[PDB]
């Protein structure tokens, strides 16, 4: 992250626990936070190398 | 034309024959071959006149800059720039130049440049077309750290010999004394040194 203010930082972490809940987990992990960030942005999380 | 530069205790004295020859016409009977490229660096010219005039002028463009920006050049430094020009004109020109100069951390130094692009530090040097007749003579009477007077007497004689034995050497024996004192021009006429 870069240029995420207090409010935003909380938005990614809370968001990352929702994501984890859907998957089947009941605790957060490192990877899930990364997934929280990809909601703020319009980036695709997983896409094949042929433009990225 | 025979030219030379010989160290002594307090500095270096450059000597030369100032005759300029095209064939068996003498182009000018006098007129130096001792050419400053700096206040405390002077150079000796022999060979082809044209080549030797032009090459020195290029060097002065380089050492003008050198002094202005990056300090005084050394005798090595001036010689290394001649050495490049003569190297790159190995096949286009021929110039026989003796570089000698006076320092505040080396005293008098001599580095001679043959007809090619070499660099060879010596404490005395002889070169040209007139020098090939006085090689055996200068060798006997060379010794380390002479007094100024003896140095002068030694150069005077050696150059007279080159006139005696070679037609492209002649006119006045000019000498450029480079010392901590300053710069002295010295000139002598034929009447005196013919005897000596």
């Amino acid at each position: 992250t870069d240029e995420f203010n207090g409010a935003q930082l909380k938005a990614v972490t809370v968001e990352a626990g929702m994501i984890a809940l859907r998957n089947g987990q009941s605790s957060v992990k490192h990877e899930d936070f990364v997934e929280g960030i990809s909601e703020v942005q319009a980036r695709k999380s997983k896409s094949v190398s042929f433009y990225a | 034309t025979s030219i030379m530069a010989v160290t002594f205790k307090d500095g270096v004295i450059l000597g030369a024959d100032s005759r300029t020859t095209t064939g068996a016409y003498i182009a000018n009977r006098v007129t130096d071959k001792l050419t400053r490229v700096h206040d405390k660096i002077w150079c000796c010219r022999s060979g082809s006149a044209a080549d030797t005039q032009a090459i020195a002028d290029i060097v002065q463009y380089h050492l003008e800059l050198y002094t202005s920006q990056y300090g005084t050049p050394s005798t090595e430094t001036a010689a290394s720039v001649f050495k490049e020009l003569c190297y790159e004109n190995k096949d286009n020109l021929t110039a026989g130049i003796i570089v000698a100069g006076y320092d505040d951390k080396n005293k008098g130094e001599v580095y001679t440049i043959p007809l090619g692009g070499s660099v060879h530090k010596l404490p005395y040097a002889i070169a040209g077309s007139g020098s090939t007749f006085i090689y055996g003579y200068c060798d006997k009477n060379f010794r380390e750290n002479m007094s100024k007077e003896e140095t002068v007497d030694f150069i005077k004689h050696s150059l007279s010999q080159a006139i005696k034995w070679d037609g492209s050497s002649g006119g006045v024996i000019r000498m450029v004394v480079l010392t901590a004192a300053g710069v002295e021009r010295l000139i002598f006429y034929p009447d005196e040194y013919e005897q000596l």
């Binding site: 490192h30 980036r43 997983k46 | -």
Partner: protein, 232 residues
């Protein structure tokens, strides 16, 4: 603003470049790969991604030379130009100096190359990381190339998507796999465990495994198919 995001020759007020930062995002979107090494061996294990199942995959390992090679994460066009430039350098070194150029010495030339396109107006920046391996007289080395172009010598690294769980694995087993020398099987083994952890929406198959290995008695060799059947 992000009106400093319009150029490659214009630094932001905080002294960043946005161009080099977006290029980091492209690694993340690129396919995961793990580097690691031992005094006598070095390995890349990379996940070979297909676009679908009518698609027969894509090589993520480019052989640079017989003692060097790189893997990729991020842009495929970008990996291609810098591989050409790097291969020329290996040829050059071998032609003119009779020498296997050191990995690290090689890496300063590729770093500059990147920064050329950073300095200039035009020239696309590069938005790929390359993991460089080689084995010279000074043993195995591992470099991590940045889209800045910085070069980092590590005993072990991972880059790409979901690659952080492989860094936590390697950290723990750091001292273990170094001491193993003269045994390629174990180092190979370690790179498989690392990249198991990465996985999401994928299971390893025979043809997701590409293992690239150079070492004390090994040429740069890329292993595929029946030879990774002992390590699926």
């Amino acid at each position: 603003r992000n009106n400093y995001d319009g150029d490659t020759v214009t630094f932001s007020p905080t002294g960043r470049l946005f161009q080099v930062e977006y290029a980091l995002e492209a690694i993340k979107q690129g396919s995961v790969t793990v580097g690691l090494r031992s005094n006598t061996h070095a390995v890349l294990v990379a996940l070979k991604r297909n676009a679908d199942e009518l698609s027969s995959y894509q090589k993520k390992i480019i052989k640079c030379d017989e003692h060097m090679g790189l893997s990729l994460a991020g842009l495929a066009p970008d990996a291609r130009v810098l591989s050409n430039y790097l291969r020329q350098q290996c040829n050059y070194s071998s032609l003119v100096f009779n020498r296997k150029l050191a990995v690290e010495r090689a890496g300063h030339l590729l770093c500059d190359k990147a920064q050329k396109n950073t300095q200039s107006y035009g020239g696309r920046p590069y938005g790929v990381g390359l993991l460089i391996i080689g084995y010279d007289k000074s043993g195995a080395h591992l470099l991590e190339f940045q889209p800045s172009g910085n070069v980092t010598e590590l005993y072990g690294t991972a880059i790409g998507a979901r690659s952080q769980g492989a860094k936590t694995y390697l950290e723990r087993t750091l001292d273990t796999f170094i001491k193993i020398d003269g045994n390629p099987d174990e180092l190979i083994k370690a790179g498989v465990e690392a990249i198991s952890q990465s996985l999401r929406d994928e299971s390893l198959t025979v043809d997701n495994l590409s293992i690239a290995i150079v070492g004390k008695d090994t040429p740069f060799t890329i292993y595929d198919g029946e030879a990774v059947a002992k390590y699926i």
